Amino acid sequence: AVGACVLCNSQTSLRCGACIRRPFLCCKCCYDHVISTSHKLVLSVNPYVCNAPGCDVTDVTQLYLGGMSYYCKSHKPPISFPLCANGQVFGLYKVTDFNAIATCDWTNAGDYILANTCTERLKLFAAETLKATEETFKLSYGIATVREVLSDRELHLSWEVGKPRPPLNRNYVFTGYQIGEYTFEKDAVVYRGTTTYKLNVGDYFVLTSHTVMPLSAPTLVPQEHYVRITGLYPTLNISDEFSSNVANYQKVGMQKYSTLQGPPGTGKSHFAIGLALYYPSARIVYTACSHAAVDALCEKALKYLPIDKCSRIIPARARVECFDKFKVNSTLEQYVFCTVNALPETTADIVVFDEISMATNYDLSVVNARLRAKHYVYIGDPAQLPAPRTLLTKGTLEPEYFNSVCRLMKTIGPDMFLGTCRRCPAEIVDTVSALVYDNKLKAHKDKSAQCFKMFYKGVITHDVSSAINRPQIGVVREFLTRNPAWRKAVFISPYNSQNAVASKILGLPTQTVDSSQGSEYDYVIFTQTTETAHSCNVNRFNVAITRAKVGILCIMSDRDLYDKLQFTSLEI
């Protein structure tokens, strides 16, 4: 009942009862909250409510102190002091932005902008509030009960009436009933169970509503600059492979935390693992939000670091299949590879946080709370995709608002920038360099002369709200017959439903732009599907076309992005 004020640290007996997180507010700040918002309930050891039997006055602005007790205007004794006077609420030890965070529904971009331009303690309040709001929104959706089981990978579902149906993509993981986590794709629906359980008719699913723990650590620890490499011991014997990154590796040792913006295929994994070889005695924890991001860092480590000093941490509630070639759950190994949500409470000489565009401020805080480290390295690209904000429906979230790290990279610049793309044919490098990298990304590879664009709006049908463009898939089919080298191509679109249709008609392996991030393929076929803010997002467009090592075919709906593609145009 006694804590610190989230705005000015001042100790208090006062929490806001109307805030979902019930933050401690000091007398001076608690007033400015209750007098400017619909939030009027104030909590202490006992709540600020009229003590008179059967009186329902809970508004702190309508209440007074009668001796040591609280009463309304109708019940207060003659000698009574109002709880609201001289810019204070009466409590022991006697904000515009705090009010907006406390009362917003998180459906507006401007909400996320504020949660990322506010003070550091308000970034934690914002991140707790948001995640709590995100979790209580999961309860809004209807239950799905299994009507009939067709096979081992298909069934028919019955949905609760009066409650909306959640989007049936990979982003929405149900808990089966505790028969393990499950997902669905498009009345023939495809069921993907984490544990292979003989799907029972009548068994119901509910979305994994997890409890939001409070945040203590900042998103970013305060910056410290050093005169010399601190707490790390370099080599002189450093293989030429990693010689490019020696000056950056020294920068990492001469600051508390550093930011690396690595555009696609510019050597992020190579840099992350090359850091271990430069500080060979240093204990490094490798963390990212996703299992795929952590498994990509494991693959690079397997090639360059000794396998007996590497441990892949896997949560006891094992959700999806992940990296197998390390010792599992040895927290004490010199090299630890673990997702943010599974991180143990430990210390490190260096923490490397990868795929930083996908981190929320909640993720940034949890890392600082579980890992005490000499150096923090933040690797990713603010020109790539952020974490989905399930509540945000109005306005577009710009890269400078993704999280504190991206904000720094978009304002003061990143500490280090990998400027040469080794993956993509020059046609793709030149396109994205101009689009999102202010012409600072350079091509290693020559033009492939295998990068094609076709402007073809087709016809847009919708599986609920997920978009399909059968004519765009039809154009791809015609192209494949005349270009049999593309038989090996990965099909990519901004929509699962387009992918589902392209899977049946083309038989190509299929990937959403969002799930393609961090991966690379020889050939890519991209159908934009629609002209929407989703399918025209320059970050998503950037990720889409930079997956390709050799060739890409882009069937485009948007004139702007079509004209910018520096590709050979095709006819039909």
Residues of this chain that bind Zn ion (CB under 5 A): 5, 7-8, 10, 16, 18-19, 26, 29, 39, 50, 52, 55, 57, 72, 74-75, 102
The C-alpha atoms of residue 298 and residue 325 are separated, in whole angstroms, by 9
Pairing outcome for strands 3-4 and 11-12: antiparallel
**Closer residue to Zn ion (CB): 74 or 347:** 74
**Closer residue to Zn ion (CB): 103 or 330:** 103
For the CB of residue 552, give the shortest distance to Zn ion in the complex, in Å.
50
For the CB of residue 110, give the shortest distance to Zn ion in the complex, in Å.
19
The C-alpha atoms of residue 61 and residue 337 are separated, in whole angstroms, by 53
For the CB of residue 13, give the shortest distance to Zn ion in the complex, in Å.
13
The C-alpha atoms of residue 361 and residue 373 are separated, in whole angstroms, by 18
The answer to the question of whether 451 is labelled as a binding residue is no
**Closer residue to Zn ion (CB): 33 or 549:** 33
Q: Please report where in the chains the tokens 């999102």 appear, as a residue.
A: 436
For the CB of residue 104, give the shortest distance to Zn ion in the complex, in Å.
12
The answer to the question of whether 84 is labelled as a binding residue is no
CA distances from 194 to 153, 174, 190 (A): 12, 10, 13
Q: How many CB atoms lie within 10 A of CB 45?
A: 8
**Closer residue to Zn ion (CB): 18 or 146:** 18
For the CB of residue 82, give the shortest distance to Zn ion in the complex, in Å.
13
Task: Please enumerate in sequence order all residues whose Cβ is within 8 A of that of 73, keeping only pairs 6 or more positions apart, or say none.
Answer: 62, 64
Q: Are 424 and 445 in contact (CB under 8 A)?
A: yes
For the CB of residue 67, give the shortest distance to Zn ion in the complex, in Å.
15
The answer to the question of whether 291 is labelled as a binding residue is no
**Closer residue to Zn ion (CB): 72 or 397:** 72
Q: Gaps in the chain (C–N > 2.5 Å) come after which residues?
A: 94, 177, 186
Q: How many CB atoms lie within 10 A of CB 71?
A: 20
Q: Are 454 and 555 in contact (CB under 8 A)?
A: yes
Pairing outcome for strands 521-527 and 442-443: unpaired
Q: How many CB atoms lie within 10 A of CB 133?
A: 19
For the CB of residue 49, give the shortest distance to Zn ion in the complex, in Å.
9
The answer to the question of whether 66 is labelled as a binding residue is no
For the CB of residue 36, give the shortest distance to Zn ion in the complex, in Å.
10
For the CB of residue 94, give the shortest distance to Zn ion in the complex, in Å.
11
The answer to the question of whether 26 is labelled as a binding residue is yes
The answer to the question of whether 225 is labelled as a binding residue is no
Give all strands (DSSP E) within 274-407, no chain letters: 284-288, 310-312, 327-328, 335-339, 346-353, 371-380
Position 75, amino acid: H
Tokens of 369: 């709370």
**Closer residue to Zn ion (CB): 9 or 347:** 9
Concatenate the DSSP letters of all residues of 413-468 into one string.
--SEE--EESSS-HHHHHHHHHHHSTT--EESSPP-S-EEEEE-----EEETTEEE
For the CB of residue 121, give the shortest distance to Zn ion in the complex, in Å.
10
The answer to the question of whether 54 is labelled as a binding residue is no
The answer to the question of whether 554 is labelled as a binding residue is no
The answer to the question of whether 504 is labelled as a binding residue is no
For the CB of residue 63, give the shortest distance to Zn ion in the complex, in Å.
8
The answer to the question of whether 395 is labelled as a binding residue is no
The answer to the question of whether 30 is labelled as a binding residue is no
Give the DSSP H/E element, type plus range, for residue 158: strand 155-159
The C-alpha atoms of residue 223 and residue 327 are separated, in whole angstroms, by 34
**Closer residue to Zn ion (CB): 53 or 222:** 53
**Closer residue to Zn ion (CB): 75 or 547:** 75
Position 398, amino acid: E
**Closer residue to Zn ion (CB): 19 or 60:** 19
The C-alpha atoms of residue 209 and residue 132 are separated, in whole angstroms, by 10
**Closer residue to Zn ion (CB): 19 or 314:** 19
Q: In Å, how far from its chain's centre is CA 442?
A: 28
The C-alpha atoms of residue 251 and residue 289 are separated, in whole angstroms, by 25
Tokens of 561: 């992005």
The answer to the question of whether 104 is labelled as a binding residue is no
The answer to the question of whether 375 is labelled as a binding residue is no
Q: What is the DSSP letter of 383?
A: T
**Closer residue to Zn ion (CB): 125 or 362:** 125
The C-alpha atoms of residue 414 and residue 258 are separated, in whole angstroms, by 8
**Closer residue to Zn ion (CB): 28 or 374:** 28
The answer to the question of whether 289 is labelled as a binding residue is no
For the CB of residue 88, give the shortest distance to Zn ion in the complex, in Å.
11
Q: Are 16 and 1 in contact (CB under 8 A)?
A: no
For the stretch 292-321, what's the b/e string if a residue is b when 16 or more beta carbons lie within 10 angstroms of its beta carbon? Answer: bbbbbbbebbeeebeeebbbbbbeeeebee
CA distances from 398 to 54, 109, 112, 260, 565 (A): 51, 9, 10, 19, 22
Residues flagged as binding site for a ribonucleoside 5'-triphosphate: 262-269
Binding-site annotation, residues for Zn(2+)? 5, 8, 16, 19, 26, 29, 33, 39, 50, 55, 72, 75
Residues within the annotated binding site?
A: 5, 8, 16, 19, 26, 29, 33, 39, 50, 55, 72, 75, 262-269
